[PDB]
Design a protein around this nucleic acid. Structure first.
Length: 462
DNA sequence: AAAAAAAAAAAA
């Protein structure tokens, strides 16, 4: 057991990790110095017959459902394959924007196919990381030694590689490795600091709530116009999510926090910028310590870089001093999150991963499912406590092993498909394709893609 | 040991 990194990327048929499906997965394993270990893998996932890909996604990836169907395996097999790669001990699974996207795909694919949704990222000394915020952090805090493309800095891999003398899912993986190498070379101490601080316990320690100790925070939510950076201070741990802390963005306008009550603050917080009119935005942001957030002591952002980024230290310090003497603000921000309407998921079991953890007993039961021949599942004498499992099991069987359904199950699946491919859904889908063909009438390649999508839909619904 | 869905923020 030697420590390795497993760089990876998915291409999918849509943006929703629960309701859309993966098309392709690519991975490359390296040692701690980013020398390639073994052989790159890239493989496709065959979409089940109750799904149509989002046209926008296919135009981005160039991957048709026909293509994935032809050279992919079903999702049960696609899941097992990735699961075996991910659960090699002492693996740090990472990518580029994976925490907010690819990792969610992983969790849901495991969930739908009876694998633990999270163990790949913690068990047997595994962990995860994400190079996107590393690049953003390097640009904001220690940009020396690297060339940063702009027009506003860009963090697209293609732009980042071109600007630093460096040469598709597999392509993205190779490029992510190259940026990792670069930053480790030019800013080894920042790199190692970020790597060690992927651990939520090192992060948690930086937060001091009673003191409102200020920190620098680099986040895509701050925006390129300020180099994704600001000084923040913790107001309270989130009342419902123990892995979230409520931060004030010290660079913002704290008026609303002092003036408004929690109900108006909540309303305002979830108001679109373009709907705010006269009113100041609420300068509150959640930091999720289990999501590899970039946090460091306040002085990690040098005055020269605050200046470069257009961030005003005295303004932040001013806000901080005022907040420290207005503790009533803490109560109010917690209320924004504590007194909100609970989130009720839809009755679609695909969307219920976050309803709760499964028990040890259910895990044992799911383990047996995975060890049973599909043809023998119907005869499987077993019982489940979590009410999601029977629903997941029916979907699992119908999507992956349709030959194993009895007549009544066949009829149920037929009704499910009809309830998906309604005349209203099919017409929305037709109108989207027609709109896109118009938008791209001059582009032979995209038009052929849109034609494939129409043909796939026609086939699947007849 | 593991989590939180959407809203909004941002970038794609």
């Amino acid at each position: 057991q030697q420590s390795t990194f497993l760089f990876h990327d998915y291409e999918t048929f849509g943006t929703h990790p629960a309701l859309d499906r993966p098309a392709q997965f690519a991975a490359i394993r390296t040692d701690s110095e980013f020398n390639v270990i073994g052989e790159p893998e890239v493989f496709y996932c065959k979409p089940a017959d109750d799904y149509l890909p989002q046209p926008g996604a296919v135009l981005i990836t160039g991957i048709t459902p026909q293509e994935a169907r032809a050279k992919g395996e079903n999702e049960a097999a696609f899941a097992a394959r990735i699961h075996s790669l991910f659960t090699v001990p002492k693996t740090c699974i990472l990518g580029y924007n994976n925490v907010r996207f690819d990792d969610e795909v992983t969790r849901n694919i495991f969930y739908r196919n009876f694998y633990d949704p999270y163990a790949w990222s913690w068990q047997h000394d595994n962990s995860r990381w994400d190079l996107l915020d590393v690049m953003r952090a390097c640009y904001a805090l220690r940009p020396e030694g690297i060339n940063w493309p702009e027009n506003l800095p860009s963090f697209r891999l293609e732009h980042l590689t071109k600007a630093n003398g460096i040469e598709d899912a597999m392509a993205d993986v190779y490029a992510t490795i190259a940026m990792a190498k670069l930053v480790k070379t030019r800013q080894p101490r920042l790199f190692d600091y970020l790597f060690t601080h992927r651990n939520k316990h090192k992060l948690m320690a930086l937060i001091d709530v009673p003191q409102m100790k200020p920190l620098v925070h680099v986040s895509g939510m701050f925006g390129a116009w300020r180099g994704n950076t600001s000084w923040v201070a913790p107001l309270a741990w989130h009342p419902e999510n123990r892995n979230a802390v409520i931060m004030v963005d010290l660079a913002g306008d704290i008026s609303p926090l002092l003036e408004l009550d929690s109900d108006t603050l909540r309303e305002r917080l979830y108001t679109a910028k373009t709907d705010l009119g006269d009113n100041a935005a609420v300068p509150v942001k959640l930091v999720h310590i289990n999501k590899c957030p970039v946090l460091a002591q306040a002085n990690t952002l040098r005055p020269e870089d605050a200046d470069r980024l257009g961030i005003n230290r005295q303004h932040c310090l001013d806000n901080l001093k005022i907040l420290r003497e207005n503790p009533q603000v803490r109560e109010k921000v917690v209320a924004i999150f504590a007194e909100a309407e609970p989130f009720t998921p839809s009755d679609n079991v695909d969307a219920q991963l976050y309803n709760g953890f499964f028990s040890d007993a259910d895990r044992a039961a799911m383990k047996i499912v995975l060890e049973t021949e599909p043809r023998n599942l119907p005869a499987l004498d077993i019982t489940f406590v979590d009410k999601r499992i029977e629903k997941l099991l029916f979907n699992y069987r119908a999507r992956n092993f349709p030959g194993t359904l009895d007549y009544a199950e066949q009829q149920r699946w037929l009704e499910h498909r009809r309830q998906v491919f309604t005349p209203e859904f099919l017409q929305g889908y037709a109108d989207e394709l027609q709109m896109l063909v118009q938008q791209y009438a001059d582009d032979k390649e995209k038009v052929a893609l849109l034609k494939a999508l129409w043909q796939y839909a026609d086939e699947i619904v007849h």
